[PDB]
Design a protein around this ligand. Structure first.
Ligand SMILES: O=S([O-])[O-]
Ligand SMILES: O=S([O-])[O-]
Ligand SMILES: [Cl-]
Ligand SMILES: [Cl-]
Length: 415
């Protein structure tokens, strides 16, 4: 008669939004869904305890990069049946399909719920003033850097700040998404964070391709295109700087589009020049291709659940077309179910349609049991690289030294 579901704070009123989302399910099945909101401050420790103790909810949200770790503990129920009901492998972007299982596992243990992806917002007024065309600027890395150089040389001033814009704003090391900000550049160069050989995983952060991508990105902040102050800040703070009219180009997710429609008084930026002059482009095509970072969250069923049939019916509901569109809107994310990308909620909005175009270039990390150690050691060393950038002292040699140190530590952790 009750299901217990743990979620993270994905929407502006996390428990109210989720309860509204599931109310039709509760009526149809005659059950009550009891939702607990795990603040991002405590979510991972609460989930880990549940997994280690065998005490916890029926379903939990999992970030896509946590699926391998929790699956490897052997505490998750298989959900092949739910995914086949939703259309199988072909119903999902392959990057999203990768997140349904521990890498190499025969069975699915997570149901895709919603996708985070990143694309560049830009100031359509600033690019027009600079004589930069977005089609050309985001067609290649060379065009990207050439567009920032035009934006740096431009005399354009924001009509409210009365100041020139930073060509590019990005966090450096002081953000939750350090690796995710770097990943499209690693991938575009032809690199990857880890590689498999003999079924054993090792770091590839020190490969020649990975180093080219990392240097291309980090060095933009050494060339005058990113303000030093940006490197102190997290993504949320850089989003505020863009809203305030201080940045011509910056990467974020689809939630900024809804923020642009909402008054400043209610936490949005509708009144600001940036909201009235807003563009989106995908990450620019690199040497070996165009990639869009995918993250977001899935749902999993603990094998100590007393209510596995009803929990699987809720997975099918949350994973399915109607709830996919409703919850994508609530969270400012993209549906995990790829069919939902053609819904008018995305297609009627030009900026959301650009996110849909970016989405087909999606790529994610391998679903490793040891992923958190990989990311943590990657980000420590990328941090030290960002510290050299802030001093104008990041050389190609210094970057290679730091990624060799990271690779040695990663390979030890993976063994
Ligand atoms: O380059 S503009 O025409 O998209
Ligand atoms: O590419 S060098 O100018 O950092
Ligand atoms: Cl992928
Ligand atoms: Cl990778």
């Amino acid at each position: 008669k009750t299901l217990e579901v743990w979620i993270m704070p994905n929407s502006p009123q996390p428990a109210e939004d989720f309860k509204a989302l599931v109310a039709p399910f509760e009526k149809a099945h005659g059950v009550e869904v009891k939702v607990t909101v795990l603040d991002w401050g405590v979510a991972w420790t609460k989930i880990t305890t549940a997994a280690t103790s065998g005490v916890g909810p029926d379903l939990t949200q999992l970030g896509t990069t946590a699926v391998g770790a929790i699956s490897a503990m052997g505490v998750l129920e298989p959900v092949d049946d739910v995914l086949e009901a939703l259309g199988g492998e072909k119903a999902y972007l392959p990057a999203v399909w990768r997140t349904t299982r521990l890498e190499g596992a025969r069975q699915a243990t997570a149901v895709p719920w919603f996708s985070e992806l990143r694309a560049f917002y830009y100031r359509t007024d600033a690019l027009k003033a600079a004589g930069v065309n977005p089609a050309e600027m985001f067609a290649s890395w060379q065009g990207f850097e050439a567009g920032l150089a035009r934006l740096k040389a431009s005399s354009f001033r924001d009509p409210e700040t009365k100041a020139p814009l930073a060509p590019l704003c990005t966090p450096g090391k002081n953000s939750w998404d350090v690796l995710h900000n770097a990943a499209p550049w690693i991938w575009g160069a032809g690199g990857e964070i880890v590689r498999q050989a003999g079924g054993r995983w090792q770091s590839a952060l020190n490969s020649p391709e990975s180093l080219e991508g990392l240097y291309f990105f980090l060095s933009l902040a050494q060339k005058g295109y990113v303000p030093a102050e940006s490197l102190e800040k997290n993504t949320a703070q850089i989003e505020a700087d863009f809203q305030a009219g201080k940045c011509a180009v910056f990467a974020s997710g689809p939630w900024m589009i809804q923020r642009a429609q909402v008054p400043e008084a209610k936490g949005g930026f509708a009144e600001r020049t940036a909201a009235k002059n807003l563009g989106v482009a995908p990450y620019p095509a690199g040497p070996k291709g165009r990639y869009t970072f995918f993250g977001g969250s899935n749902l999993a069923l603990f094998n100590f659940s007393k209510n596995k049939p009803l929990a699987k019916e809720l997975l099918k509901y949350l994973g399915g077309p109607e709830a996919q569109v409703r919850y994508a809107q609530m969270t400012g994310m993209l549906p995990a179910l790829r069919s939902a990308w053609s819904d008018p909620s995305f297609q009627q909005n030009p900026l959301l349609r650009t996110f849909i175009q970016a989405a087909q270039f999606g790529r994610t990390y391998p679903s490793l049991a040891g992923w958190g150690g990989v990311e943590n050691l990657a980000v420590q060393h990328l941090g030290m690289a960002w510290d050299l950038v802030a001093q104008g002292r990041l050389t190609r040699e210094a970057l290679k030294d730091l990624m060799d140190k990271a690779s040695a530590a990663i390979n030890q952790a993976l063994r």
